[PDB]
Amino acid sequence: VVAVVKLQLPAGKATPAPPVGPALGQHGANIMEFVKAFNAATANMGDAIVPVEITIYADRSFTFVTKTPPASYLIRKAAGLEKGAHKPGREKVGRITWEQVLEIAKQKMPDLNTTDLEAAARMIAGSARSMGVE
Amino acid sequence: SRIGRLPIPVPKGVSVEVAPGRVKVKGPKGELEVPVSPEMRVVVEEGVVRVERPSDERRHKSLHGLTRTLIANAVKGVSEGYSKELLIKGIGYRARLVGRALELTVGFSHPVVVEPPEGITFEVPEPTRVRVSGIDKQKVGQVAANIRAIRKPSAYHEKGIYYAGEPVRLKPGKAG
Amino acid sequence: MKVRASVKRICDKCKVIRRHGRVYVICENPKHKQRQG
Amino acid sequence: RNVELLATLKENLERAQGSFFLVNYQGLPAKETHALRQALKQNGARLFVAKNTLIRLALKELGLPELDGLQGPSAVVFYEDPVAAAKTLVQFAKSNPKGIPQVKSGLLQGQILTAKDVEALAELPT
RNA sequence: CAGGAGGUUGGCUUAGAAGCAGCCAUCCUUUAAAGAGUGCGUAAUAGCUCACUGGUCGAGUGGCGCCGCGCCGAAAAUGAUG
């Protein structure tokens, strides 16, 4: 009987210096240093907050896979998100071109709270404000 | 005592309160009276008890909730008793039971001993942990704080006699 | 910390008590332990 | 704040028909007993499925809605769950096992109405 | 007293915000009403209070446009007092 703890990695990177040290090492885990393993599943999918069933068995089954990133991020990421270096004020060509917002807010809408029939009409109110374009 | 008034269910013991000084409810061994104020004459009733007010002046509605809740806790303790429990951390120093008072090793270099009042309740069922019980409640707390008053706090470091439900803080010193 | 004014609460969870005449401010923080008497 | 609104709309979301019940399920974070409560849009379809007006506020607002006064849950928590909003025909069996196969005493129900009178609490679960 | 339904799971930083590290965000499902998620915080989390509530319970409770009277701010030099 091994209990699980809910987590989330970084998205895009693979290194697990602190992520695979005291964070998980506290409750219960096994072998670490998953550059080989996290590049095998991180690179092919994700700029957009990716969360997969984090299982801490014994690092026997290769990760890689990749779950469909969630709503706001996988709608709103491919603008660049370029600002933030200085101060927060939704600048840095944060214009996304709503047709591009539809083709990022496009087929990938499988798993959410009981439905989303179209995420480019009602979920854009969360996406655009959380990014910065009001 | 409430936004309205409250019933006070009564079991085991009886009541009385004829002297006027303080009404009473003792169980099997309980003879704890209460020194209740003048008028605000309480009503002796059936298996439930209620209480009054002549008006809504900020003397009478001040005395009202105290007049209820000083009888409502007197009726409870005389049949079973109250208790308060007391944890003690440290690097290896505990209390014992030489007579019916209790020792401790904290830095008097062997002995620390303190004597209980008439509500004597020493009971150890572990190795260092101790709990106090009895009939009263206003004097249980000050005895369970007079036990605390020897090496009470712990600032930088996990030491010290504690309570049970306290999350007491830490902060680093030299390094960490 | 006896200031003779400036008893304006600042820790956002403090609260003010009058007792025996004085005015005390009690937060859950030992930095703010004001009393104006 | 609330005076002319709230009820004038929670009672409209309760009086789409007359086949309501009561409900309560309470302790965790929001989306996965929104699994049960919002997949009342899976076992049903977006119904006011405990849209949760109040009680004592709904209890003297339901005279204005005139839904026969289904006053059973003046005890432990009332939802006044209006399962008649989309389809109250078989959703009770799906809503009982959503809280039955979970943590102990998950979804307690109170009163119920079988579209013309008040159904009993002992016969609402079965 | 009883309860806090997880797509709210970063944007730089992801070494880490999942309201509760350093920056504004002023949407939606749904129900005990919603927490654009106020506070204690460390390695994020872990959790706790209500700033929301249904329950519980039931009728004087949160501020003021202003006045009447009072309180702290107020320490001497032969023994005191209107």
Q: Helix/strand/coil (H, E, C) string of B26-55?
A: CCCCCCCECCCCCCCCCCCCCCCCCCCCCC
Burial class (CB in 10 A: 0-12, 13-18, 19+), D67: buried
CA atoms A108, A112, A115, A121: torsion sign: negative
How distant is the alpha carbon of residue B37 from its chain centre?
22
Strand partners, B130: B86
Instruction: Give A116 CA → E13 C1' in Å.
Output: 31
Q: Same CATH topology for A1-67 and A68-134?
A: no
B15, B44 contact by CB (below 8 A): yes
Angle (CA) B117-B118-B119 rounded to 5° is: 90
- Any known ligand binding at C32? yes
Instruction: Give D71 CA → E66 C1' in Å.
Output: 48
Joined tokens for residue D89:
């025909």
What's the rounded Cα separation, in Å, for the pair A12 and A39? 8
How distant is the alpha carbon of residue A98 from its chain centre?
22
Question: Which nucleotide in the DNA or RNA is closest to residue A8, CA to C1'?
Answer: E9
What's the rounded Cα separation, in Å, for the pair D124 and D119? 7
Q: Which residues contact B151 (CB under 8 A, 6 or more apart)?
A: B106, B107, B159, B160, B161
D65, D114 contact by CB (below 8 A): no
Length of chain B (residues): 176
D41, A112 contact by CB (below 8 A): no
Instruction: Give C23 CA → E79 C1' in Å.
Output: 35
Report the amino acid identity of residue A32. M
Joined tokens for residue A56:
């801490």
Q: What is the CA radius of gyration of chain C?
A: 9
What's the rounded Cα separation, in Å, for the pair A105 and A120? 6
Minimum Cα–Cα distance from D41: chain A residue? A114
Alpha helices of chain B — where are they, by DSSP H?
60-69, 74-77, 138-146
Query: Nearest protein residue to E61's C1' (by CA)?
Result: B3
Nearest to C33 by CA among B32, C20, C16: C16
How distant is the alpha carbon of residue B68 from its chain centre?
18
Instruction: Give C33 CA → E48 C1' in Å.
Output: 24
Cβ atoms within 10 Å of C29's Cβ, excluding its own: 11
Joined tokens for residue A18:
């602190």
- Any known ligand binding at C20? no
Q: D60-63 contacts: CB < 8 A, separation 24 or more?
A: D61/D7, D61/D10, D61/D11, D62/D11, D62/D14
Joined tokens for residue B120:
């004597």
- Ordered by start, the domain boundaries in chain A are 1-67, 68-134
Q: Would you identify the CATH topology of the domain A1-67?
A: Ribosomal protein L11, N-terminal domain (3.30.1550)
Asked if the C-beta of D16 comes within 8 angstroms of chain A's C-beta atoms, the answer is no
What's the rounded Cα separation, in Å, for the pair B42 and A58? 70
Experimental approach taken: cryo-EM
What's the rounded Cα separation, in Å, for the pair D106 and D110? 13
What's the rounded Cα separation, in Å, for the pair B89 and B91? 7
What residues of chain D lie within 8 A of the CB of A115, using their CB? 41
Q: Which residues contact B106 (CB under 8 A, 6 or more apart)?
A: B93, B112, B150, B151
A vs D, Cβ pairs < 8 A, gives 11
Which bases on strand E have an atom closer than 7 Å to a protein beta carbon?
2-12, 14-18, 23-35, 37-41, 43-45, 53-61, 71-74
CA atoms A19, A23, A29, A30: torsion sign: positive
CATH architecture of the domain A68-134 equals Orthogonal Bundle (1.10)
A70, A41 contact by CB (below 8 A): no
Strands B130-134 and C15-19: unpaired
Strands B82-86 and B130-134: antiparallel
Nearest to C37 by CA among A103, A69, C24: C24
What residues of chain D lie within 8 A of the CB of A114, using their CB? 34-35, 38-39, 41-42
What residues of chain D lie within 8 A of the CB of A113, using their CB? 31, 34-35, 38
Asked if the C-beta of D93 comes within 8 angstroms of chain A's C-beta atoms, the answer is no
Chain A: closest CA distance from residue D9 (Å): 23
Nearest to B129 by CA among B83, B174, B173, B171: B83
A-C interface (Cβ pairs under 8 Å ≥ 3): no
Query: Nearest protein residue to E3's C1' (by CA)?
Result: D26
Q: Do the Cβ atoms of D35 and A114 come within 8 Å?
A: yes
Strands B130-134 and D118-119: unpaired
Nearest to B39 by CA among B25, B51, B48: B51
Joined tokens for residue B14:
């009886």
What's the rounded Cα separation, in Å, for the pair D52 and D54? 6
What is the three-state SS of chain A? Answer: CCCCCCCCCCCCCCCCCCHHHHHHHCCCCCCCCCHHHHHHHHCCCCCCCCCCCCCCCCCCCCCCCCCCCCHHHHHHCCCCCCCCCCCCCCCCCCCCCHHHHHHHCCCCCCCCCCCCCCCCCCCHHHHHHHHCCC
- Any known ligand binding at C11? yes
What's the rounded Cα separation, in Å, for the pair B136 and B147? 17
Q: Which residues contact B176 (CB under 8 A, 6 or more apart)?
A: none
Chain A: closest CA distance from residue D11 (Å): 25
What residues of chain A lie within 8 A of the CB of D34, using their CB? 113-114
Strand partners, B161: B88
- The DSSP annotation for C1-37 comes to -B-SS-----SSS-EEEEETTEEEEE-SSTT---B--
Q: What is the CA radius of gyration of chain B?
A: 21
Joined tokens for residue B83:
């208790």
Task: State the virtual CA torsion across A14, A18, A23, A24 in degrees, nearest 10.
Answer: 50
What residues of chain A lie within 8 A of the CB of D31, using their CB? 113
B10, B49 contact by CB (below 8 A): yes
What is the three-state SS of chain D? Answer: CCCCCCHHHHCCCCCCCCCCECCCCCCCCCCCCHHHHHCCCCCCCCCCCCCCCCCCCCCCCCCCCCCCCCCCCCCCCCCCECHHHCCCCCHHHHHHHHHCCCCCCCCCCCCEECCCCEECCCCCCC
Joined tokens for residue D120:
């009993």
Main-chain phi, psi angles of A23, to 5 degrees: -55, -60
> E strand or H helix at B172, and its extent?
none
